[PDB]
């Protein structure tokens, strides 16, 4: 047995597992299956430790997984992430997005920027909403948005175009493109072939 060849095969399999888990995470996110998403994300983070050197495609795959994790936790009331990063999950999703269709990219970017503030207002945390606003936008629009937060004007018309549902719809359209690109990756294709043979 050659330890070097065994290690290379383990890295090849880690690559296959990463694509399979990204495809699973994308489907769980699209379907709103939060518990399945939570389990798949735990598996993706563990499997990613099996790769020490990533290709450009593999880097894109791990950042998509990290991005969807932060979007899925967008309205969380758990302070552990913010205690570590000193920013909210939607702000972290924005940092990832900023690296990784320029029109769709810009639309998602602006929806996340506004919703990073709006989810704080929805949760009744207006001090955090103003803190998020200062980190993102620290202009008449900026003054209007500052007045909205100041007056706790959670249902201002500004949020009809920049809504939580519009952010989720645009992100899900992007997820459908990731789903198509990865739908024929090795592991899921072999697994689907096994299932189709039993019917």
Ligand X SMILES: CCN1N=C(C(F)(F)F)CC1=O
For the chain, counts of helices (H) and of strands (E): 11, 0
Per 3-state DSSP, the chain is made up of helix, strand and coil in percentages (nearest 5) of: 80, 0, 20
Shortest reach from residue 55's CB to ligand X, in Å: 16
Fill in the DSSP letter of residue 125. -
In this complex, which beta carbon is closest to its own copies, that of residue 135 or of residue 182? Answer: 182
Contacts with ligand X in 69-128 (CB under 6 A)? 69-70, 72-73, 76, 81, 89, 92
* Chosen from its own copies, ligand X, none, partner binding at 182 (C-beta under 5 to 8 Å by type): none
Q: How many CB atoms lie within 10 A of CB 8?
A: 11
| Residue selected from 81, 158, 164, 186 as contacting its own copies according to rule CB under 8 A | 186
Instruction: Report the C-alpha gap between 11 and 61 in whole angstroms.
Output: 15
Position 57 contacts its own copies (CB under 8 A)? no
- Residue found under tokens 């936008």: 137
Dig out the tokens for 150 from the structure. Answer: 């100041």
C-alpha 20/C-alpha 39 separation (Å) is 13
Q: Which is nearer to ligand X, 45 or 153 (CB)?
A: 45
Helix (H, G, I), strand (E, B) or coil at 67: helix
Judged by beta carbon distances under 5 to 8 A according to partner kind, the member of its own copies, ligand X, none in contact with residue 10 is its own copies
Do residues 47 and 17 lie in contact, with contact meaning Cβ atoms separated by under 8 Å? yes
The distance of closest approach from Cβ of residue 25 to its own copies in the complex, given in angstroms and rounded to an integer, is 11
**CA-CA distance, 44 to 22, in Å (whole number)?**
7
Q: Which does 66 bind (CB under 5 to 8 A by kind): its own copies, ligand X, none?
A: ligand X
Q: Which does residue 125 bind out of ligand X, its own copies, none, counting CB within 5 to 8 angstroms by kind?
A: none
**Contacts to ligand X by CB under 6 A:** 28-29, 32-34, 37, 41, 44-45, 48, 62, 65-66, 69-70, 72-73, 76, 81, 89, 92, 168
Summarize as ranges the residues that interact with its own copies (CB under 8 A): 3, 5-6, 8-10, 12-13, 16-17, 20, 24, 27, 31, 39-40, 42-43, 45-47, 49-50, 186-188, 190-192, 194-196
């Amino acid at each position: 047995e050659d330890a070097g060849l065994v290690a290379e095969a383990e890295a090849v399999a880690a690559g296959w597992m990463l694509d399979f888990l990204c495809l699973s995470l994308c489907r769980a996110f699209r379907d709103g299956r939060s518990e399945d998403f939570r389990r798949t994300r735990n598996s993706a983070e563990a499997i990613i430790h099996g790769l020490s050197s990533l290709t450009a495609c593999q880097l894109r795959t791990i950042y998509i997984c990290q991005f969807l994790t932060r979007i899925a936790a967008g309205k969380t009331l758990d302070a552990q992430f913010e205690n570590d990063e000193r920013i909210t999950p939607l702000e972290s999703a924005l940092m990832i997005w900023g690296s990784i269709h320029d029109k769709l990219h810009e639309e998602i970017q602006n929806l996340i920027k506004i919703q990073a503030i709006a989810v704080c207002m929805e949760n009744g945390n207006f001090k955090e909403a103003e803190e998020v606003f200062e980190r993102i936008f620290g202009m008449p629009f900026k003054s209007k948005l500052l007045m909205i937060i100041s007056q706790k004007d959670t249902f201002h018309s500004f949020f009809q175009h920049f809504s939580y549902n519009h952010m989720m719809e645009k992100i899900k359209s992007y997820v459908n493109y990731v789903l198509s690109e990865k739908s024929s990756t090795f592991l899921m294709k072999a697994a689907a072939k096994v299932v189709e043979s039993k019917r």
